[PDB]
Symmetry: C4
Subunit: 334 residues, 4 copies
């Protein structure tokens, strides 16, 4: 029995080898951006509304042509077999059963076709490959397998400096591989190549500048994820939650605006929604649940988040996620 | 001998079973809103006035047609027999003797008629029941028993997620019951039903949004309590003290504006007054005093608060609570 | 050898009985205003100027018709025999020798005439007595003894709630008495009575509201001390340093504007000057020095402060205190 | 193997005598300005750009007529033989090999001619001497030896009060001397004398006021270093990083604007650049590396900083330092 996401972190910390826990937990550099993701959420307070009709409270949203049970998707996290032997299959099954989109990674430890076969209308996260032709072939594989959106990660020209991994001498165990294989930096030209190659919605993950959000809309993106990559890329990058309101105003409904980084409760989902997010991604907590108890762990996490989201929405007077987006917020201290 | 409200918390902590102390102390979720109630008060500084006539300093106010000895009432707190065998009767007797209004709860552990028989011109807190007819019958009981105001709690469509209570497996002992009995979410329609059923002032407790405060006035409320329910309802709800000034400006004398959450001294009462509150509610400290020493404990607490309020008002140059409302404040750090 | 004021606090803490140290160190209530005096100074940063002529750096000021060696006076502190057997005489001698004004207290433990006989052109602090006639007789005594200013304390209608003193059961030892004797709250009428009774400058100590500063000028005050009484009066009163800039702007050279509360270095004196203060008062540190080493201790403290003030002024490009008043500041964090 | 600058501080702390470590680490007074240099950087967050061309990322700049490999120079630090027997020669050799300017000190423990003979196009830091003639002779020596800029330190009319050094009784060992010899306060007249005596760019180090930055341009300075001297001069001086943006706007390209104080990573270099700095100086970390491992230590530090700067720039979408200067920032908390 878990009553908060923090219960799952404690359980994952028990079970995982230290170096693997550090791979999961860590950020780049001094971990300033990692810590700031939490600090930034903790400073946001919601102004709830009272006395509204709550006879049909629903946490559902429509996004990228699909109904989702919550305004949430599982974030792309590479190499999930590091955390449990069933890896991506356990997580994708739990996500499917919960009605939550699952993001299949370019660096998945089980092939994208196997994970897509689980069902649940999955998304696919793209890292740009050595050339256009191979990148587009990977997009086409994902589309052929029934993925419903391409989440193009745009904040990784290369991987950040993860000092925990350097100090630990961390490397993949021989039994964990990039199962989609037997990279070069993305540009706006890469985005255009992807957009022309698929009719699936293209979602740019890792946008923080307002003008990059605008340009994403102009480039034909169906969504963006406002994100500092969980503090794993540029150390000192602003948290996504701190740019979200400005970005939502700037795109002016031109694309879906998601956010990630440090979402650890249904209350945090509500804060994100109140700042204007269409939905959130959740990364580390899903992996804690996977490490702790496999598929059943992830199921319990998603059930817990669903109850927390419903609870927060109703206490704030919101019968729908749209209503939650119209909530006001106030910044506080600590 | 107690010289601060904090002396009473230490005494209550000694005597109470852990699970009962946690029921009393706790908040919802991560307890962010619970902590913020204190943080928010600690950031407020008063700009005192000097050299004013203090020859007849009075802490009295007129509210809901009654003189009160202090700008304070005892907050509604369910199930007071959890804290002392005399429960609500001990607290109501001490409040009566101090000239402070006592709020009788829907979930009182002694019947509202018994508590009202104590005297002291009590108020009645309403939770909306399964239907209109039963809710209105409860209002009529309170009115028939001589209650002078209906404090309609509007922030509890359901009870929040209290993780201390979940972790402790807390439940009422068999010897504590809801003595008014042998609930459904409130709406603005419920408010209207209550307003039409009684000539008593209706006070909406748990308002945080400015437009909800305005709407409360438009709905015929005689007062509101600006409140996040002591951090026990929405985790991440703004503290009432942070919304109070804006709300006072918006209602523009159209109803009484009370505040609660974290009031722990006469100095805090002064801060609330200087931000525009008509009066405060005090919850947890009253229960600490009850746990520590029964009726006499509550008497000592109210005597201590009375002396602190008088002290703070005079040091700030205020011969009346009205003068205290005209004090200016300045936000500081930590 | 002491190299900071903090060295003196450690020495005083060694020697003094605990209850006496607490009488000296403590504030009212939760000590929020006591702590805030320090916090507020620590948030202020100076923008120093470079490359100015420093060939005749002087820390002198003219104030209330007298040259002072530093922009500083010893604050009124009652009952100095609590800290050392020579009490006020030791402090007044050291102040005289340093060229710093000494404020003789109404509640001095040596008679005001004895302390004035030390020399050094002293000031006299007044508490308003039971009636006008006795109050004015005390003012006349001070004037007859050669005091040069009347520092009328206006923030003590009564003494604040000092919880350390209550918890310790603190009372004066039989060997410490109010030597000026064998009180009622001051008002603006009291100020006028004093102003009409003496041609000495009347200085109102304990002003925090801007309109009280204006009114002080209109009332014929020669100065004010912007002060929360070292956090010993209203708990939650804003620090003087936080009101100082606004007050200086409002009085627009109409009277001298001093500040006190938490001045613990020459750097802090510079901050106060840069915010517009004419001079500061220093309280607790003078008593630490007295406790630690009597007259010689106070001499060493004043020599240390003189060197720190000279150092700070020159490093900031200021050849005079007037130049220091023209420095700009910037608020920072922690 | 060092993966952060903090690894080098730990190593230096191991090896150095305590009093020498304190000479290096310490600041003046309470060390408020020392701590604030770090706090101020930690509050700055970068808004990175995505999807830009990074096929030729370069960290090079042109400054004072020379290409530098990074937007960084080694700060002037007196008496480097305190930290390692090779002192300035070890540091200058490593700087030369890394393509980073090295600032030769007036108070170098090896003669300026010997250090200049190392090569690498060095700068020379000037303290104003007892008269104009001797000061100008020192400038001429530096110029004759091939120094390329005169870094005139303008924040040291005298040295600040370093309480660690006072408490330790610190003095130079007999084997460390001011090798350029067998001082008076600088003014704007001194600056003019230097400017007329050399065609080398004159760089004023220790500017914090906006009008001093303007005046520096008007005086013919080729650059300024916005700096509080690592918190070693005025205790309470604003950090340079907090004045940098305002100063950059005010000089409006009229001179190079460098900053120092607390730069401890390539991420911090990026923050400085994004606030408008042309380049940074790095002081203490270079000495940590020197203490830890001599010339090879300094080489490793500069290689580490080069990799961190390249990493941060690319992750932020900047192919050049000019692009980094066009990044936006956002202030956060803690
Ligand atoms: C171990 C780990 C691996 C990750 N791998 C990827 C990846 O392959 N692609 C990607 O776009 N994001 C990746 N992310 C970033 C997440 O998608 C997400 O942005 C971040 O974890 C969200 O923050 P949260 O973990 O605080 O919920 C990874 C994060 C972690 C912790
Ligand atoms: C144990 C407990 C029970 C409570 N029960 C009720 C209730 O039945 N109805 C209600 O409107 N508020 C209830 N409250 C909220 C209080 O009325 C009040 O809003 C809150 O406690 C004020 O904060 P304070 O405790 O910080 O003074 C309760 C609070 C506590 C701590
Ligand atoms: C032990 C003690 C006694 C004091 N007595 C008096 C007094 O008799 N009259 C008065 O105007 N202020 C009195 N003060 C206040 C000081 O004059 C001054 O406002 C305060 O101490 C300044 O702060 P500092 O102690 O932080 O320097 C007293 C302060 C202390 C600590
Ligand atoms: C031990 C030490 C000696 C210094 N000596 C000088 C000096 O002789 N001349 C000068 O202009 N600055 C001097 N500085 C200041 C540095 O040039 C620089 O402004 C400061 O150290 C930059 O901060 P950082 O150490 O945080 O990188 C010295 C600093 C230290 C720590
Ligand atoms: O994307 C990531 O943050 C990440 O940690 C990673 C590192 C190496 C391979 C794949 C993902
Ligand atoms: O940093 C890298 O080289 C790396 O492994 C990578 C991973 C994913 C996308 C781009 C680069
Ligand atoms: O109102 C409350 O906060 C509360 O704690 C409660 C919980 C259960 C029943 C009654 C009150
Ligand atoms: O959460 C509940 O179901 C509950 O017990 C309750 C209590 C008071 C009012 C409304 C609901
Ligand atoms: O003025 C004071 O703060 C003070 O502490 C005091 C208390 C009693 C008598 C005199 C002064
Ligand atoms: O609080 C008091 O009664 C008190 O002792 C006093 C002391 C000085 C001035 C006014 C009152
Ligand atoms: O410039 C300095 O900060 C410094 O520490 C110093 C002190 C004495 C001599 C030379 C430099
Ligand atoms: O403070 C001093 O006297 C000192 O040593 C010095 C050092 C360098 C420049 C100016 C003064």
């Amino acid at each position: 029995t878990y009553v908060s996401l923090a219960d799952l972190e404690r359980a994952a910390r028990d079970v995982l080898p230290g170096e693997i826990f550090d791979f999961l937990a860590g950020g780049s550099g001094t971990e300033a951006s990692l810590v700031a993701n939490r600090t930034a959420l903790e400073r946001v307070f919601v102004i709830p509304r009272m006395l509204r009709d709550l006879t049909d409270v629903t946490t559902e949203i429509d996004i990228f042509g699909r109904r989702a049970a919550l305004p949430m998707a599982v974030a792309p996290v590479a190499y999930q077999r590091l955390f449990h032997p069933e890896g991506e299959l356990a997580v994708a099954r739990a996500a499917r059963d919960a009605g939550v989109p699952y993001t299949i990674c370019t660096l998945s430890s089980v092939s994208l076709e196997e994970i897509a076969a689980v069902g649940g209308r999955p998304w696919f996260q793209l890292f740009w490959l050595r050339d256009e032709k191979r990148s587009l072939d990977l997009v086409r594989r994902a589309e052929d397998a029934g993925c419903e959106a391409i989440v193009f990660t745009v904040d990784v020209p290369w991987m950040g400096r993860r000092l925990r991994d350097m100090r630990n001498g961390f490397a993949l165990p021989e039994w964990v591989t990039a199962a989609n294989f037997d990279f070069a930096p993305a540009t706006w030209e890469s985005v255009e190549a992807v957009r022309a190659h698929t009719d699936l919605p293209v979602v740019l993950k890792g946008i923080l500048a307002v003008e990059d959000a605008r340009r994403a809309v102009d480039a034909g993106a169906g969504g963006i994820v406002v994100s500092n990559h969980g503090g794993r890329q540029l150390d000192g990058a602003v948290p996504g939650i701190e740019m979200l309101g400005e970005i939502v105003a700037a795109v002016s409904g031109g694309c879906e605006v998601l956010v990630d980084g440090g979402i650890r409760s249904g209350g945090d989902v509500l804060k994100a929604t109140a700042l204007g997010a269409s939905a959130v991604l959740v990364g580390r907590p899903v992996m804690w649940a996977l490490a702790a108890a496999g598929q059943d762990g992830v199921r319990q996490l998603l059930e817990l988040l669903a109850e927390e989201v419903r609870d927060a929405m109703g206490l704030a007077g919101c019968e729908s996620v749209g209503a939650a987006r119209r909530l006001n917020t106030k910044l506080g201290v600590v």
